[PDB]
Amino acid sequence: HGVQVGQVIDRKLTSKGVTFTVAIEPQHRELVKGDSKFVVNSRVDVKVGLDGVEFLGASASEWINGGIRILPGDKGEMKASYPLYANLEKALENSLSDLPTTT
Amino acid sequence: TFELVPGDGEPRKEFVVVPGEKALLHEPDVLTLTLTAPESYGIDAGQPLILHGVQVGQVIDRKLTSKGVTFTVAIEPQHRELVKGDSKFVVNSRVDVKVGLDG
Secondary structure, three states, X not given: OOXXXXXXXXXXXXXXXXXXXXXXXXXXXXXXOOOOEEEEOOOOEEEOOOOOOEEEXXXXXXXXXXXXXXEOOOOOOOOOOOOEEOOHHHHHHOOOOOOOOOO | OOOOOOOOOOOOOOOOOOOHHHOHXXXXXXXXXXXXXXXXXXXXXXXXXXXXXXXXXXXXXXXXXXXXXXXXXXXXXXHHHHOOOOOOOOOOOOOOOOOOXXX
16 A cells, blocks of 8 residues: 555575565554455556556656555465466456466 | 754753654644545655645654555644645645647
């Protein structure tokens, strides 16, 4: 919600991909609500058009800050691993793959 | 540097020192307001309050709750009479650009 509640501790590169270990302060520990989402805010996206022009990803303060945005949830059990989504649209669609599934 | 602001009343020999951030909060006349928002909108605790292009106040602090974000702000007594309580507060921390054929 625009407020810094944590900090990325470390990053490791493996064969499968990249694993980030992050920490959340105890003050906002109760607001995590484990059934939540994490979104990348380190890249800016600009879309232009005749009627729809948008500037997503990160604002100027968000671009100079960077980091990970947290989309909170309602009720969860705080599982260990979490996925990281490339952009907002994929997070909303709950799609963790570039190509959508065939139907 | 210790700065002295004289007052009036019975003489005293003990004082409580407040930081410079809270200096406006401890003035004899000051208008303290609490305003809520679902998002921080990138507003810190040192941002000013602007009326007609003139700074008339200063944001004192920001707190994050479950419902949202609450800002406590202060208005100087000089412009206390110009507040006119049935008033509105608008975010000025983000810029918006709308393009079009004519507008």
